Amino acid sequence: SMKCKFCSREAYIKIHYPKMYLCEEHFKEYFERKVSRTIERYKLLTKDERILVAVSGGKDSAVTAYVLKKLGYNIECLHINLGISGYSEKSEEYAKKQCKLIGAPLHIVRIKEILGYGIGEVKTRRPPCSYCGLTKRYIMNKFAYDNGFDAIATGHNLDDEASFLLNNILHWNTEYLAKGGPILPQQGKFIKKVKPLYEVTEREVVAYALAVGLEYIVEECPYATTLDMKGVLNELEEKRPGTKFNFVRGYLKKKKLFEPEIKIKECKICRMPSSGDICAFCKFWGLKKEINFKVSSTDEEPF
Amino acid sequence: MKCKFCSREAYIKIHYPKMYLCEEHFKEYFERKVSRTIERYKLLTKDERILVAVSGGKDSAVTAYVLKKLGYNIECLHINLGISGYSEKSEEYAKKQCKLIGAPLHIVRIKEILGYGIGEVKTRRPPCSYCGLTKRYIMNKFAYDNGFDAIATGHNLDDEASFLLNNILHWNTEYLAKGGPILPQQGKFIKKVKPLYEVTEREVVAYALAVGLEYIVEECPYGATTLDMKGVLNELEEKRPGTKFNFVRGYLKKKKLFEPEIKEIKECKICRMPSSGDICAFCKFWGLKKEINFKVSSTDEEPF
Numbered sequence: 016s017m018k019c020k021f022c023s024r025e026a027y028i029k030i031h032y033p034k035m036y037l038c039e040e041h042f043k044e045y046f047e048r049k050v051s052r053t054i055e056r057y058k059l060l061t062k063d064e065r066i067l068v069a070v071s072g073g074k075d076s077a078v079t080a081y082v083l084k085k086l087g088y089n090i091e092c093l094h095i096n097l098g099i100s101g102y103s104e105k106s107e108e109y110a111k112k113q114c115k116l117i118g119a120p121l122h123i124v125r126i127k128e129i130l131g132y133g134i135g136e137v138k139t140r141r142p143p144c145s146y147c148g149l150t151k152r153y154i155m156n157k158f159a160y161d162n163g164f165d166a167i168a169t170g171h172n173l174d175d176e177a178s179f180l181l182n183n184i185l186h187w188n189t190e191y192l193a194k195g196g197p198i199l200p201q202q203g204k205f206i207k208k209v210k211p212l213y214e215v216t217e218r219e220v221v222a223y224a225l226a227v228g229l230e231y232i233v234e235e236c237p238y239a240t241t242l243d244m245k246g247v248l249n250e251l252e253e254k255r256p257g258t259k260f261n262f263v264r265g266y267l268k269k270k271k272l273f274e275p276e277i278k279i280k281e282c283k284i285c286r287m288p289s290s291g292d293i294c295a296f297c298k299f300w301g302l303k304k305e306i307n308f309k310v311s312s313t314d315e316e317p318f
Numbered sequence: 319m320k321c322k323f324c325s326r327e328a329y330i331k332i333h334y335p336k337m338y339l340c341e342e343h344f345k346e347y348f349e350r351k352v353s354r355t356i357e358r359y360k361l362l363t364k365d366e367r368i369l370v371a372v373s374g375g376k377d378s379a380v381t382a383y384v385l386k387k388l389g390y391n392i393e394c395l396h397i398n399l400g401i402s403g404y405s406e407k408s409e410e411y412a413k414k415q416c417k418l419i420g421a422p423l424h425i426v427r428i429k430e431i432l433g434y435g436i437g438e439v440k441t442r443r444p445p446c447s448y449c450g451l452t453k454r455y456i457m458n459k460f461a462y463d464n465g466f467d468a469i470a471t472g473h474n475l476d477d478e479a480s481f482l483l484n485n486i487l488h489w490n491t492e493y494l495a496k497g498g499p500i501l502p503q504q505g506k507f508i509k510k511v512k513p514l515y516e517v518t519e520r521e522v523v524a525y526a527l528a529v530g531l532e533y534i535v536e537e538c539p540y541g542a543t544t545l546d547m548k549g550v551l552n553e554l555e556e557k558r559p560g561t562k563f564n565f566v567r568g569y570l571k572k573k574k575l576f577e578p579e580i581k582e583i584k585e586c587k588i589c590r591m592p593s594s595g596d597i598c599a600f601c602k603f604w605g606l607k608k609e610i611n612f613k614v615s616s617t618d619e620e621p622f
């Protein structure tokens with residue numbers, strides 16, 4: 016029903032804030048420039064850096080890898096196959112597809128193969144959601160550490176951070192609120208984690224994926240409070256535009272207030288940053304040996 | 319359904335904790351819940367002169383009704399904002415409420431003591447901004463001049479949760495530093511309490527209906543952000559019950575974290591009330607040269 020603000024081509028998307036109608040080609044350029052600005056603003060990455068993009072098969076990580084590669088970054092991708100039968104199989108396939116289109120090396124880690132059982136197979140009263148996050152985070156860091164990557168880039172966008180903030184404020188998880196934001200610096204054996212999509216919304220991600228022809232898993236894991244928070248914040252954004260941004264940017268200014276609400280050791284098994292004698296990952300899976308994630312070359316590209 | 323304690327038919331269902339109560343059992347429960355809030359946060363004693371700031375709305379009406387039923391030494395104050403077509407019936411609803419409650423009502427008319435009502439001032443500033451400042455001053459000055467020990471407001475759980483949610487979204491750390499059910503006596507500032515702090519609006523609406531309390535449902539003409547936050551929190555309460563309470567109680571524990579975000583106090587050159595500069599915010603705004611004396615010998619309805 017409209018036309019592009021910079022050309023005679025028909026409008027593809029309307030940016031709710033700031034108001035402007037852009038076509039496919041102009042939206043891509045805008046979205047890419049918005050990401051580059053997020054990198055520049057928070058000093059996330061340099062061009063002389065080995066980056067590991069944690070791809071899951073979803074839209075978020077797919078676009079992160081695509082944009083970073085288009086912006087000329089030294090990226091490689093990692094897929095952690097959780098081993099959820101009927102889910103994780105096509106999830107691995109979507110990532111292979113995504114990385115082939117992107118033109119980036121893809122490394123695959125299969126939980127069922129290295130640990131024994133997949134997520135939702137462990138004889139535990141603990142929900143799969145609780146230990147899945149802990150398992151994904153460990154393999155992400157250990158893989159990047161063992162292969163000497165400078166940084167880890169996740170798919171987490173503005174909607175993801177706002178819903179994370181809203182949930183944590185409601186439950187007053189001050190320790191989690193203390194360590195949030197677009198960058199988590201290199202501290203010990205913990206690799207620097209960045210969020211290049213921190214300032215963009217899910218609608219801009221969905222639209223970007225569609226335009227660049229990126230296929231992803233829309234369906235979410237069978238084992239959620241996240242979708243509740245996101246809908247609540249979308250309702251608020253309708254009435255008052257800019258809410259999500261002003262809330263997230265405001266949080267970054269006041270993030271210093273939660274510092275006294277947060278407190279160290281090295282694991283006896285994997286030597287990774289632990290709280291006690293043995294780390295949370297090693298204690299859970301009952302591991303006696305260290306998983307070595309060092310690889311000479313990818314599955315698709317050996318030698 | 320039927321009542322959990324008698325053969326009488328259910329009047330209301332408490333979403334958390336789950337129980338069906340009749341009119342007579344709900345009143346008793348609601349009253350006990352308020353008494354517990356008083357006891358828990360050490361809000362009031364029986365040997366205290368209390369001023370309930372009644373507005374004509376459900377909140378302040380119930381606060382006065384419950385406190386009087388719990389045997390407290392209450393007197394009520396109505397601040398008539400002078401909003402033509404609104405403030406007139408608002409004053410009438412309070413007169414009605416206090417007559418039912420059986421409490422002395424003191425009326426202060428803005429248009430009469432200041433000159434112009436709220437929304438009549440030649441200012442680009444919205445009426446909502448200076449109305450709150452004006453209500454707060456008269457509330458404190460009246461309680462101070464008549465030597466009341468405390469001020470009790472109608473603010474309930476939904477009011478606090480929406481206040482918290484809005485202030486967190488705008489990261490107003492200074493406002494978040496000084497929240498909660500009690501604001502103690504500091505200088506010429508009178509102790510402010512919230513006896514309805516733990517009860518929800520649905521429990522207030524139901525209590526008013528049961529005790530036969532008529533109030534103004536309609537809100538002031540001067541879009542309000544409060545109704546947005548409340549609807550958002552009601553949506554959250556549906557899916558996850560107890561959310562509002564766990565969020566408010568959790569805030570009280572972490573309230574200490576916003577203390578470094580609030581930094582000497584002065585006395586006004588005109589009214590001698592707690593000021594930031596030479597002249598206070600109230601006196602500077604209305605351009606007052608003289609001090610308004612709120613000391614009264616006896617009420618409008620009960621003179622001599």
Ligand code: SF4
Binds near residue numbers: 134147148236237238
């Ligand atoms: S939603 Fe699924 S993938 Fe995400 S943390 Fe939970 S179990 Fe793991």
Ligand code: SF4
Binds near residue numbers: 445446449450537539
């Ligand atoms: S909503 Fe009306 S009564 Fe309430 S503070 Fe604003 S102007 Fe005053």
Ligand SMILES: [Zn+2]
Binds near residue numbers: 019024039
């Ligand atoms: Zn265009």
Ligand SMILES: [Zn+2]
Binds near residue numbers: 283285287297298
């Ligand atoms: Zn370990």
Ligand SMILES: [Zn+2]
Binds near residue numbers: 324340
């Ligand atoms: Zn009953």
Ligand SMILES: [Zn+2]
Binds near residue numbers: 588597
């Ligand atoms: Zn003054």
